[PDB]
């Protein structure tokens, strides 16, 4: 395994799911029965959107969006009145990557905050985000489609599933991406839920650098069969995103 220092860290890229990343997600409309109110707050961007947006920032691509996207929220979503349709005019977008900064500390201009919030909202919509205080998407299968069809990334973009490869061949594909300076979209499920994140480095001893999309919290080196960030888990136990794993590789503009 080649040594590759964190690609996202090298470019200062650290996104999150709350403010100021979520200033253009849908505003929560309803209180879920038995839950405290999030009414009037913007929905989380979604880990799938945050992971994808960080990779998009790494490439500062696209210059221009290719195709709009529209979808309808599930009617069992308790945070919105139904039916609820969402729309992103991605075909009209000219993303200014000067204004979409690598990270946000709060002191940025409203133009800079709106720039990342627009990208976040576009990406979330393109992957049919189930918006809420937390926001969920199917992930990989929608991400690979969105990157090519809506945002114009190269046809090299595709999903790979962990179950389709030996451990060696799986990690070899991740290694190849990193060797070509291409961060990898990655997701998995376990006993602390499902999550999407970015693989962007390797330390030569079969650990990979992970950017979890929580603004930096828990970022570090992990084995791909022990993707277990300590930021999660109440009670003091173990848990990680080690099942139903998939990735989106070949992410590049040209
Ligand atoms: N944020 C948040 C919610 N999580 C999420 O959307 O994860 C996507 C996901 C789908 C299928 C398998 C593993 C992760």
Residue 163's domain is classified under what CATH number? 3.90.70.50
- In the residue annotation, 195 being an active-site residue is answered as yes
Cα-based distances in Å from 233 to 88, 134, 139, 193, 239: 35, 16, 22, 10, 7
For residue 47, report the distance from its CA to the centre of ligand 1, in Å.
Answer: 7
Residues 32, 18: Cα–Cα separation, whole Å = 20
- Report the DSSP beta bridge partners of residue 243: 189
Residues 53, 32: Cα–Cα separation, whole Å = 29
Residues 22, 118: Cα–Cα separation, whole Å = 8
User: Does residue 188's CB lie within 6 angstroms of at least one atom of ligand 1?
Assistant: yes
Question: What is the Cα 137 distance to its own chain's centre?
Answer: 10
Residues 29, 42: Cα–Cα separation, whole Å = 10
- Answer for the pair 252, 182: CB distance below 8 angstroms, yes or no: yes
Residues 228, 242: Cα–Cα separation, whole Å = 8
Residues 37, 79: Cα–Cα separation, whole Å = 10
Grouping H, G, I as helix, E, B as strand and the rest as coil, residue 208 is strand
Domain containing 169: what range? Answer: 1-254
Domain count, the chain: 1
Angle, helices 110-126 vs 47-59, to 10°: value is 120
Write the residue with the smallest CA distance to atom 10 of ligand 1: 138
Number of H helices, E strands in the chain: 5, 9
Strand segments (E) across the chain: 3-4, 69-72, 85-88, 158-161, 184-190, 193-203, 208-211, 220-222, 243-249
Burial class (CB in 10 A: 0-12, 13-18, 19+), 227: buried
Resolution of the model in angstroms: 1.6
Which of 54, 128, 187 has the most ligand 1 atoms within 8 A of CB, as the residue to mutate? 187
Residues 253, 30: Cα–Cα separation, whole Å = 40
For residue 116, which of 244, 24, 47 has the smallest C-alpha distance? Answer: 24
């Amino acid at each position: 395994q080649p040594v590759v220092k964190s690609l996202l860290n090298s470019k200062g890229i650290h996104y999150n799911q709350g403010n100021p990343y979520n200033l253009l997600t849908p505003v929560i409309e309803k209180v879920k029965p038995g839950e405290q109110s999030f009414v009037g707050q913007h929905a989380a961007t979604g880990c799938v959107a945050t992971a994808t947006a960080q990779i998009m920032k790494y490439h500062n691509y696209p210059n221009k969006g290719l195709k709009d996207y529209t979808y309808t929220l599930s009617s069992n979503n308790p945070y919105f009145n139904h039916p609820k349709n969402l729309f992103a005019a991605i075909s009209t977008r000219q993303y200014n990557w000067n204004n979409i900064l690598p990270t946000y500390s709060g002191r940025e201009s409203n133009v800079q905050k709106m720039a990342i919030s627009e990208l976040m909202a576009d990406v979330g919509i393109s992957v049919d985000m189930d918006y809420g205080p937390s926001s969920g998407s199917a992930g990989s299968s929608r991400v690979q489609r969105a990157l090519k069809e809506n945002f114009g990334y190269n046809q090299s973009v595709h999903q790979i599933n962990r179950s389709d490869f030996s451990k060696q061949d799986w990690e070899a594909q991740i290694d190849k991406e990193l060797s070509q300076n291409q961060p990898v979209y990655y997701q998995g499920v376990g006993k602390v839920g499902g999550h999407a994140f970015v693989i962007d480095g390797a330390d030569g001893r079969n650990f990979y650098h992970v950017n979890w999309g929580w603004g930096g919290v828990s970022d570090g080196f992990f084995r791909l069969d022990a993707l277990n960030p300590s930021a999660l888990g109440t009670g003091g136990g173990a848990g990680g995103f080690n099942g139903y794993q998939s990735a989106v590789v070949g992410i590049k503009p040209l």
